[PDB]
Design an enzyme around this catalytic site. Structure first.
Site, PDB file in Angstrom:
ATOM      1  N   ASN A 159     -33.299  16.592 -13.516  1.00  0.00           N
ATOM      2  CA  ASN A 159     -33.788  14.626 -13.186  1.00  0.00           C
ATOM      3  C   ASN A 159     -32.742  14.379 -12.726  1.00  0.00           C
ATOM      4  OD1 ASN A 159     -35.771  15.226 -15.723  1.00  0.00           O
ATOM      5  ND2 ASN A 159     -37.106  14.947 -14.270  1.00  0.00           N
ATOM      6  N   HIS A 160     -31.858  12.987 -12.435  1.00  0.00           N
ATOM      7  CA  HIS A 160     -31.661  12.697 -12.111  1.00  0.00           C
ATOM      8  C   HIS A 160     -30.448  11.474 -12.992  1.00  0.00           C
ATOM      9  CE1 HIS A 160     -32.105  12.616  -7.550  1.00  0.00           C
ATOM     10  NE2 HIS A 160     -32.068  13.843  -8.049  1.00  0.00           N
ATOM     11  N   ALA A 192     -31.521  19.831  -2.274  1.00  0.00           N
ATOM     12  CA  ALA A 192     -31.344  20.484  -0.896  1.00  0.00           C
ATOM     13  C   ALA A 192     -29.921  21.513  -1.733  1.00  0.00           C
ATOM     14  CB  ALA A 192     -31.077  19.837  -0.556  1.00  0.00           C
ATOM     15  N   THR A 243      12.670  -3.343 -21.792  1.00  0.00           N
ATOM     16  CA  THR A 243      12.828  -3.003 -20.970  1.00  0.00           C
ATOM     17  C   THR A 243      13.317  -3.582 -19.779  1.00  0.00           C
ATOM     18  OG1 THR A 243      10.797  -1.223 -20.049  1.00  0.00           O
ATOM     19  CG2 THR A 243      11.761  -0.414 -21.870  1.00  0.00           C
ATOM     20  N   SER A 298       1.688   4.701   2.571  1.00  0.00           N
ATOM     21  CA  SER A 298      -0.274   5.704   2.634  1.00  0.00           C
ATOM     22  C   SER A 298       0.034   6.131   3.631  1.00  0.00           C
ATOM     23  CB  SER A 298      -0.563   4.835   2.014  1.00  0.00           C
ATOM     24  OG  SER A 298      -0.720   3.815   1.006  1.00  0.00           O
ATOM     25  N   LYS A 344       0.586  -1.081  -0.125  1.00  0.00           N
ATOM     26  CA  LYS A 344       0.196   0.131   0.033  1.00  0.00           C
ATOM     27  C   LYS A 344       1.129   1.121   0.067  1.00  0.00           C
ATOM     28  CE  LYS A 344      -4.801  -1.047   1.194  1.00  0.00           C
ATOM     29  NZ  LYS A 344      -6.298  -0.760   1.265  1.00  0.00           N
ATOM     30  N   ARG A 355       7.391  -2.905 -16.199  1.00  0.00           N
ATOM     31  CA  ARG A 355       7.145  -2.438 -17.318  1.00  0.00           C
ATOM     32  C   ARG A 355       6.436  -1.710 -18.079  1.00  0.00           C
ATOM     33  NH1 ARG A 355      12.888   0.587 -16.438  1.00  0.00           N
ATOM     34  NH2 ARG A 355      12.150   2.236 -17.728  1.00  0.00           N
ATOM     35  N   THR A 399     -31.426  17.448   1.868  1.00  0.00           N
ATOM     36  CA  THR A 399     -31.188  16.177   1.233  1.00  0.00           C
ATOM     37  C   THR A 399     -30.086  15.361   1.887  1.00  0.00           C
ATOM     38  OG1 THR A 399     -30.273  16.911  -0.827  1.00  0.00           O
ATOM     39  CG2 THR A 399     -33.423  15.876   0.172  1.00  0.00           C
TER      40      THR A 399
HETATM   41  O1  LIG Z   1     -35.280  22.726 -16.998  1.00  0.00           O
HETATM   42  C1  LIG Z   1     -34.734  22.069 -16.155  1.00  0.00           C
HETATM   43  C2  LIG Z   1     -34.098  20.890 -16.722  1.00  0.00           C
HETATM   44  O2  LIG Z   1     -32.796  20.875 -16.682  1.00  0.00           O
HETATM   45  C3  LIG Z   1     -31.655  20.123 -17.332  1.00  0.00           C
HETATM   46  O3  LIG Z   1     -31.969  20.468 -18.657  1.00  0.00           O
HETATM   47  C4  LIG Z   1     -32.426  18.693 -17.418  1.00  0.00           C
HETATM   48  O4  LIG Z   1     -31.900  17.883 -17.989  1.00  0.00           O
HETATM   49  C5  LIG Z   1     -33.552  19.059 -18.235  1.00  0.00           C
HETATM   50  O5  LIG Z   1     -34.561  17.392 -17.809  1.00  0.00           O
HETATM   51  C6  LIG Z   1     -34.520  20.021 -17.270  1.00  0.00           C
HETATM   52  O6  LIG Z   1     -35.713  19.583 -18.063  1.00  0.00           O
HETATM   53 FE   LIG Z   2       7.842   2.874 -18.681  1.00  0.00          FE
HETATM   54 FE   LIG Z   3     -31.343  15.990  -5.861  1.00  0.00          FE
END
Ligand SMILES: OC[C@H]1O[C@H](O)[C@H](O)[C@@H](O)[C@@H]1O
Ligand SMILES: [Fe+3]
Ligand SMILES: [Fe+3]
Length: 689
Positions: free
Chosen positions: A594-595, A466, A117, A259, A73, A121, A459
């Site tokens: 959106n996520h 959040a 070499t 480490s 390590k 390596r 969150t």
């Molecule tokens: O206006 C909000 C927009 O934000 C970002 O562009 C997101 O990718 C989309 O999903 C959402 O509609």
């Molecule tokens: Fe090398």
């Molecule tokens: Fe979120």
């Protein structure tokens, strides 16, 4: 007060001598003190260093690898910088050099004499050998790799190879009695230049080296024209075409240290003084990046520009990267093992409850999907960067970090609708979600303009709805970076466990892991934040409009939920107004992305395919959804994906993080960085550098 000396580990007399000259001149400059320990091979220093016999060693990408393997390590402290007339780089191209009129192509090396070499390596072994594995016709591990290469090449000079059990590997090696095939510059054919001479002296037919190495030994265009490069596309191009004709592009060599208690500070000061004092043309009394003609690259690669410090969280895995890590790990795994990982998809679950659900997903999908877990979301992202995981669903806030580290958004979470289940949802334009500020109808005293000194439920730090969005708007009003002083007390999983931001947090059921940023903290997430409100631990909660709706009016029958009502809660609008949770469209703090699932741009397409199928089987319309598994449900705990997810859709062209998150938010997130940055953010700044 005083701090001791860096013990540098050398591998041969020539190296010690240089080291001594180095110590000598260092003391003469009245700067940081060095010390020279002598072992016999880079492999040995690695061992020496871990046992506190020494402290530092320069190592090629390949050895950094083993150095980082468990028993030792060790971690890369400073990377060497090189310039072959571009931007100096912390990377270099590995190439295969041959004399013109030799005829081979890269797919005809069987039976050729070769000069390497050294064993282990990058350019000299790990990369060429991984390139030729398909022609070795090798069983896999049971059978030593050294045994194949030996049967493959007529003879070779692979310093550090068992010249005993596999003499074919040491045969071309020039060296005295026992100096032959030595793992040091004792063996005249060790290293980039060693391998090159082995070629020019006519001992081998192909030199496996670095991009510069030809130019380093043959300073005249006329002599280099006597040599060529074997390109991975079975053609031969001139030596100054390495940019096109390369077997691979590896990370520079690097100074490694322990480490724990490695004195990274001591080592860096030493090296910062060294470049400044003996770097390129700084001095004449001593040249750090220059060596004797008989033996090259002593202590460091001759002609390196200098060093760059490697940030703290970076370990060998992240330093090397997925590309490199895979190919190296892949020389120690079976063909079936490789192909097997390449076809599955490893998801990264954040926390215990997620790995549970992921495991269900794995079993149920006949393992087209496997799991990988971490305590946090940053760790997962790192896993993804090392190449140990293939993806995960992330909040806009972390899509930012992932994007800054090179990951791209593959598919996006489309919440359950409303216009028509019209298309499916897979082509519906993601429409995002409204971030809101919730408080109880009860405290009517309370107004956005009165949050100051009140209790807050988030969150988690780093997240859109959040943190990012409320803290973004507050920092604008108070111009203060002291985020832990606005709200009197708060619960924001992810913060400093001793800060007020973790005050209201509650940990699991037996009150352990308070404030941890994952499901184990009961007041974590949209659901957790909202609850922190319902159980009156906080006065205001930052979440999305829908979160309230999904836990009030009895929809969530967990004890603390059951009795709550849409009626008991109202939102705080930016204009000091207050509307029912239903008027959020006219009372929000922001419109969030959106996520989204993210992965390395490489894996994206495969990832997509596997996900389209998996969700068609267990998605929102999954035939086997209520039946055997619903990918988008988890008892309101929002595991892996949100519980209101209908399907994972197409990005509508927004394929880069900037394009997806959008102008604004990206900029807002950057203004917040002005106050605080994340170690992952930095580690990536260096790696993507
Ligand atoms: O206006 C909000 C927009 O934000 C970002 O562009 C997101 O990718 C989309 O999903 C959402 O509609
Ligand atoms: Fe090398
Ligand atoms: Fe979120």
């Amino acid at each position: 007060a005083p701090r001791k000396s860096v013990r540098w580990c050398t591998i041969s007399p020539a190296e010690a001598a240089k080291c001594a000259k180095f110590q000598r001149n260092m003391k003469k400059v009245r700067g940081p003190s060095v010390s020279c320990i002598r072992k016999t091979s880079s492999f040995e220093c690695i061992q020496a260093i871990a046992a506190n016999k020494a402290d530092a060693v320069t190592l090629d990408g390949g050895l950094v690898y083993e150095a980082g393997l468990h028993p030792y390590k060790l971690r890369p402290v400073a990377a060497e910088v090189y310039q072959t007339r571009g931007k100096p780089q912390t990377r270099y191209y590995a190439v295969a050099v041959v004399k013109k009129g030799s005829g081979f192509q890269l797919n005809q090396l069987q039976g050729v004499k070769s000069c390497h070499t050294g064993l282990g390596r990058s350019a000299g072994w790990n990369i060429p050998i991984g390139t030729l594995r398909p022609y070795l016709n090798w069983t896999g591990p049971p059978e030593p790799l050294q045994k194949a290469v030996a049967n493959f090449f007529s003879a070779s000079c692979v310093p550090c190879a068992d010249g005993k059990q596999y003499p074919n590997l040491c045969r071309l090696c020039a060296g005295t009695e026992a100096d032959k095939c030595a793992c040091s510059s004792q063996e005249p054919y060790f290293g980039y230049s060693g391998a090159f001479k082995c070629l020019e002296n006519g001992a081998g037919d192909v030199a496996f080296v670095k991009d510069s190495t030809v130019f380093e030994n043959l300073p005249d265009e006329a002599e280099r024209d006597k040599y060529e490069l074997l390109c991975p596309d079975n053609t031969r191009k001139p030596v100054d075409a390495f940019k096109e004709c390369h077997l691979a592009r590896v990370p520079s060599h690097a100074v490694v240290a322990r480490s724990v208690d490695g004195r990274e500070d001591l080592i860096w000061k030493l090296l910062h003084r060294a470049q400044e004092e003996f770097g390129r043309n700084k001095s004449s009394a001593f040249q750090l990046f220059g060596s004797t003609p008989g033996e090259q690259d002593l202590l460091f690669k001759d002609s390196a520009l200098g060093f760059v410090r490697i940030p703290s969280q970076i370990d060998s895995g992240l330093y090397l990267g997925a590309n490199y890590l895979t190919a190296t790990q892949n020389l120690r795994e079976t063909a079936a093992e490789v192909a097997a990982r390449r076809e599955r998809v490893v998801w990264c679950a954040v926390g215990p409850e997620e790995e549970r659900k992921c495991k269900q997903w794995s079993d149920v999908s006949n393992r087209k999907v496997a799991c990988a877990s971490a305590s946090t979301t940053e760790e997962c992202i790192a896993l993804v960067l090392k190449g140990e995981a293939d993806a995960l669903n992330l909040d806009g806030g972390f899509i930012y970090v992932a994007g800054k580290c090179g990951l791209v958004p593959v598919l996006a979470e489309n919440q359950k609708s409303q216009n028509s289940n019209a298309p499916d949802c897979v082509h519906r334009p993601p429409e995002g979600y409204l971030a809101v500020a919730v408080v109880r109808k009860s405290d009517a005293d309370l107004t956005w303009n009165s949050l100051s000194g009140k209790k807050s439920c988030h969150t988690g730090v780093g997240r859109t709805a959040a943190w990012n969005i409320p803290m973004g708007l507050l920092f604008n009003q108070t111009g203060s970076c002291k985020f832990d002083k606005f709200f009197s007390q708060s619960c924001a999983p992810g913060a400093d466990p001793q800060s007020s931001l973790c005050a209201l947090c509650v940990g699991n059921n037996e009150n352990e892991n308070k404030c941890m940023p994952n499901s184990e903290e009961r007041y974590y997430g949209y659901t957790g934040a909202f609850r922190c409100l319902a159980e009156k631990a906080g006065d205001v909660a930052f979440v999305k409009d829908v979160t309230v709706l999904q836990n009030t009016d009895g929809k969530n029958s967990e004890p603390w939920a059951k009795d709550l009502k849409q009626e008991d809660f109202e939102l705080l609008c930016l204009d000091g107004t207050r509307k029912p949770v239903a008027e959020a469209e006219s009372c929000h703090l922001a419109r969030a992305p959106n996520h989204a699932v993210v992965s390395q741009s490489d894996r994206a397409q495969h990832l997509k395919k596997v996900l389209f199928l998996q969700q068609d089987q267990f998605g929102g319309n999954g035939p086997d959804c209520p039946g055997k598994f619903c990918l988008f449900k988890s008892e309101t705990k929002n595991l892996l994906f949100n519980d209101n997810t209908e399907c994972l859709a197409e990005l509508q062209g927004k394929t880069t993080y900037e394009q997806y998150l959008g102008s604004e938010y990206v900029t807002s997130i950057t203004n917040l960085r002005r106050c605080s940055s994340s170690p992952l953010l930095e580690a990536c700044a260096f790696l993507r550098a």
